[PDB]
Amino acid sequence: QSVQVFGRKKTATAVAHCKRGNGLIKVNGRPLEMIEPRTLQYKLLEPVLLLGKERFAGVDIRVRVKGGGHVAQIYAIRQSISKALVAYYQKYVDEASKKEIKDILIQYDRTLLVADPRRCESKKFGGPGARARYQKSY
Amino acid sequence: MLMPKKNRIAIYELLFKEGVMVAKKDVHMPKHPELADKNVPNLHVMKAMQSLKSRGYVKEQFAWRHFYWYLTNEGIQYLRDYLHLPPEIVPATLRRS
Amino acid sequence: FPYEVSDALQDDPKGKYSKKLLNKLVG
Amino acid sequence: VQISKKRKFVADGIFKAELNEFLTRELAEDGYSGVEVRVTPTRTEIIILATRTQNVLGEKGRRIRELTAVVQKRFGFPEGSVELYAEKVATRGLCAIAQAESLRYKLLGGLAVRRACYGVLRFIMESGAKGCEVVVSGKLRGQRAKSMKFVDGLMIHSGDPVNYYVDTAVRHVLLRQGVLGIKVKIMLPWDPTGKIGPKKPLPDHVSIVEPKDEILPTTPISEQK
RNA sequence: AGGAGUGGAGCCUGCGGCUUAAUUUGACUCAACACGGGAAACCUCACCCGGCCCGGACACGGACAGGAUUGACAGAUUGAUAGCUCUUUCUCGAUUCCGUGGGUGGUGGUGCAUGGCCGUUCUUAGUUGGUGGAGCGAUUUGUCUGGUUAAUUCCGAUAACGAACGAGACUCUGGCAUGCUAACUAGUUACGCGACCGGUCGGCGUAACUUCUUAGAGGGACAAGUGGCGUUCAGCCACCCGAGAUUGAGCAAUAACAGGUCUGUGAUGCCCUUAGAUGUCCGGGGCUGCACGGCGCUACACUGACUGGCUCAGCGUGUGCCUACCCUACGCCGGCAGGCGCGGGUAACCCGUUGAACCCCAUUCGUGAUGGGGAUCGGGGAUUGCAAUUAUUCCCCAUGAACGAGGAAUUCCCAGUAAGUGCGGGUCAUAAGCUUGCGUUGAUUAAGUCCCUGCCCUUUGUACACACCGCCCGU
What we know:
Entry title: Bat MERSr-CoV NL140422 Nsp1 bound to the Human 40S Ribosomal subunit-State1
PDB class: ribosome
CATH superfamily of the largest domain in chain D: Ribosomal protein S3, C-terminal domain
Number of strands of chain B: 2
Radius of gyration of chain D: 23 Å
Distance between the termini of chain B: 43 Å
Number of domains of chain D: 2
Helix content of chain D: 25-40%
Largest sheet of chain B: 2 strands, antiparallel
Chain A: Small ribosomal subunit protein uS9
Radius of gyration of chain B: 14 Å
Strand content of chain B: 5-15%
Strand content of chain D: 25-35%
Keywords: Nsp1, betacoronaviruses, ribosome
Helix content of chain B: 25-40%
Number of domains of chain B: 1
Strand order of the largest sheet of chain D: 5-4-7-6
CATH architecture of the largest domain in chain D: 2-Layer Sandwich
Number of helices of chain D: 6
Oligomer: part of a larger assembly
Organism of A: Homo sapiens
């Protein structure tokens, strides 16, 4: 089964392997419900279980995102959930269901999926850092 | 420091049979692997070559810490007629065509 | 046109030799 | 034994620098323009690009042979494993090194600075370049030093298209007073080997290629055969 | 407007003071001073000093056939391999002090004789012809009233029209790709493994792969847009089919400097003459004779704790070709610097899944001298390198000189910046509290100004042109 949507936030290394079963996300051996940060749990568990627990029983996904940093794998798991659901319901249900699930996943997130090329910036000679110099001139 | 004559004669013979000498030589150390078997201090060779240039018989070029000499007919004739080394030895600067 | 005196003048238009170069350029 | 890849690249670079400097010092009387180097398994071929071939090969091919020796004995190649040839570059005025050498030679013969510079600029204009500037810096007249330059045509000073569109050469000429520096900079035309003409698309600069417009027949009736 | 800062409450060097030299060789600053990639125990610019030398081995004034060219060495040969106290004194040993030319070593001048290469004016937007116009002329117009851009950027106006350099475009670089008829380093559709509610086929190797990784090769999407302001133009400010709406650097013009470099140079003008010659020998040693109002450091505190939490976020070096001197995993000496041994690595293949924070934070915070030092010398035992004496020694141990961001005055700073921390590379036989790069980090911003210090344009004044550090007047 190929959906080809992935989940990728920042530079975390992720895998989305799809084959029918329950939708579970494994993070450091900790599944989706019991998560590694242990402090952002509700913000990730709210969208799926309040609508149904068998909701993820459609296609199992090996999601083994070796993410370091809480902002890294947190919200990457929800990126993966939304992307996998939208692609599965796109390719393998019908167009009208595509439209409605896309509407609910877009009221989930208006436009923040993909970013611009930027990261920590380079250092220049003549100073200790990117934009800083040596002793001051008052 | 030692000043011999037959070591310089051997150096002259190798120069004639080659055109240039291939032996790295250091003033500080008596022996270098390339310098060996031709045990004459670098200083001797370059001082003799500076005296030769002050006299003038040979051609030369310099590049990136290296000498590149050229022995013409004048130097061949001079090494022929001074050291009475007969022309049974043929110079190596005219090989092939 | 002679260029040697022209260059000598153009190097220093008010030098010690300016008068002679300008005079040589006239004729 | 074998060394690492980055070290082999650095070593071939230093070898090329050695070779270029050596052939500029040695072949400074013929008129030296450049070198090309090609590699096949254990066969390395070097070509000296110069304006005068009948003068660089020498009598019975002496110098061209002798060079091999001073390569073989220096670079450490195995015996008989180095080959080198001689061809003449198609043009001369488009190589900044060649014209810098020419200006250096003219100032070596006592020809005056301004007339020599005028000659080289006129040559470059007649060569096909759309711009050249040459600077002679140092003592030309008097104890103090003048920097005198002539520029004609066009010349970009900034941006990337100054590496693949401008050729620059810096050389020195000795004198009873001191050293004179010669800087020659040349613009190149659009298409390779000195603007042969349009070829397979490799765009590099802005151009407005205007073809011939379509023409309609004046006669009311059309062509009859 | 603030944050971090500072000869104050540690560490590295550049002046506050100098005559057994002890340090300033480049300074009119901000264009000297952790700068000469200049961390000198190598012989450092020798430096200061009982330093065996000749490093005249450029051919021609005297020139012998021994210029006189060692010593671990018993107070008489008074330093670890300097017979430099005393006619002692030797297993290669004949080897001269110089007139036609930058020669002893070419790091010694003149960088105001120069080149080249840099720095600065230059971080700003300026600069120049040709033809034409104005003026006797120097010169001017073009190069501008204005709108108004980061911008001589562009609309436009127009005695100017056409052009040239710079700016932009350009190049490299950055939280963007469901094609790489793409990959043993990275998981994998249907094989052959397989408890378990189509997987150890990444443990032969999926010939389709690809999603992360290769930022490794081929791509597009600020206007098939909206609102408002503006001459409805050039443009600017906010957003309703919507990944992308100022990344950071490189290059960087004309004209200039008596800016720096002759101590980078086989890039070079103008030179010296005669004995422990700047090159070998200097146990000891050069700024170190120094008190955080020149880079890199202390938060009087839940934003902070020692792994009950990491399937991690992440530059770039590394061995023998001259040349022995590289990176190191793993065992033992071990509860450890350091030593031994087979092993891997010319490198996405080995160091290595580089120990680049420990988010619940399993010694565990009430009026916080006392986790925000522990104002550092005792201890298994202390180095692949002669010299570690102000220095690569090394794995680590109770409150105690500071107390809430410590002002005379200062070659800092606005979207992963400031500031913590650390890790690399250059230097590196030994070594970085130096420099150059690399990592987890943001905005409701101040979407400002010309009051300081400066720069640019226009008008204007000038007795200035060596150009206000000017000229100049008088006792």
